[PDB]
């Protein structure tokens, strides 16, 4: 698997903010409070789309995609 | 046990377990040839009931074992050269061996249609 990383974030931040607090990051209010307040809290500093999971389980038969006869079919 | 007790040799191998077919397990052979000494019948123990066809065989090594005759109906008698393989009749004491039915003198069940490989039955060759 791979991980997308944009250069804009790296240039500004060096990952220190990710360790703020007790090592995991600055905590945010619960969801049932953000809907109550009128103004939305400031967005967290991190890479774009850095909370969606990756489908590792669906790469079981990836080795078969390396065969020459399969690659001709996928093309 | 303390490290000292282990230094003096406290860890010994576990007591051996008896094999299902000692005559074959002892010499690492899959099967042996023997001369049928007696073809009789053995009765199962408490739960089971019936007449199990067995055969007293004298192996080539010299051991005299009791083998079980699988299938329905056999054609062996006194002085029959039969092939012995491992196995055991779970309800017959002393019957710790089986006899191959496609063996030298023991014939296979001719009226067998399922699991012919287990009873040494050639295919009927109906169309052929």
């Amino acid at each position: 698997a791979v991980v997308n990383m944009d250069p804009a974030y790296m240039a500004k931040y060096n990952g220190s903010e990710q360790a703020a607090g007790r090592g995991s990051g600055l905590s945010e209010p619960p969801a049932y409070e953000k809907t109550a307040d009128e103004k939305p809290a400031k967005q967290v500093i991190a890479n774009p789309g850095r909370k969606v999971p990756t489908p590792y389980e669906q790469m079981t038969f990836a080795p078969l995609e390396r065969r020459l006869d399969i690659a001709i079919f996928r093309a | 046990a303390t490290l000292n007790q282990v230094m003096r040799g406290c860890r010994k191998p576990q007591r051996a377990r008896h094999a299902v077919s000692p005559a074959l397990s002892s010499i690492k052979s899959p099967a042996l040839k023997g001369v049928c000494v007696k073809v009789g019948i053995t009765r199962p123990k408490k739960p089971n009931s019936g007449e199990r066809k067995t055969a007293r065989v004298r192996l080539s090594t010299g051991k005299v074992i009791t083998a079980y005759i699988p299938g329905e109906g056999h054609n062996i008698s006194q002085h029959s050269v039969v092939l012995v393989r491992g196995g055991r009749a779970q309800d017959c004491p002393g019957v710790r061996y089986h006899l191959v039915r496609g063996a030298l003198d023991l014939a296979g069940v001719a009226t067998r249609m399922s699991s012919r490989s287990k009873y040494g039955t050639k295919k009927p060759k109906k169309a052929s």
Partner: protein, 190 residues
């Protein structure tokens, strides 16, 4: 909408307070099924003890146990008893547990270990169901002493609730506990 024509979910519809259609979206699975027997003055009385796990697949798992002379009623009891006992289970990156946990339930010790992503649920047949229902995807397990089906599930459920909270360990020691994988990639790589 006719989903519950028997009325078994009505009593549960008040405790947890959610539609019956939402109760059918929960992952349920019968784990244990014992045939117990009580000797009475009127002869043996055989019952069916069952343990069912309920989870939505996003960090909630409930364990329920019940018994009855009928196998059908015993499963519906535990199912309702497991959906109302749901509790949030902390999961690291929504894929594994925090660190390692070792629990003991009357001679049945269970040792769960956190594993890197892409490792899979290389666990036994009962833990696979609990992890697959709670939302975990990478884990390792090992039964040290005994393999009793029931205590095996009780110990594993108590282990998913006895995980070391990395923040409580930090405030107690006065020292940060940095998530190296978070700083390295700039966020929680799920």
């Amino acid at each position: 909408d006719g989903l519950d024509d028997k009325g078994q979910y009505q009593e549960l519809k008040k405790r947890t307070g959610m539609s019956v259609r939402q109760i059918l979206q929960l992952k349920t699975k019968k784990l244990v099924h014992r045939r117990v027997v009580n000797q009475t003055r009127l002869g043996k009385i055989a019952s069916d003890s069952v343990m069912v796990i309920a989870g939505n697949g996003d960090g909630w798992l409930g364990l329920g146990m019940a018994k009855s002379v009928e196998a059908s009623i015993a499963v519906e009891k535990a199912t309702l008893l497991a959906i109302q006992n749901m509790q949030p289970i902390p999961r690291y990156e929504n894929r594994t547990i925090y660190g390692e946990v070792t629990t003991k339930v009357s001679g049945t010790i269970v040792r769960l270990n956190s594993r890197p992503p892409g490792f899979g649920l290389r666990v036994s047949h009962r833990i696979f169901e609990m992890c697959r229902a709670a939302g975990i995807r990478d884990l390792s397990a090992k039964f040290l002493r005994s393999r009793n089906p029931m205590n095996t599930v009780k110990a594993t459920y108590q282990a998913l609730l006895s995980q070391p909270n990395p923040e409580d360990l930090a405030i107690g020691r006065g020292k940060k506990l940095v998530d190296v994988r978070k700083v390295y990639y700039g966020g929680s790589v799920y």
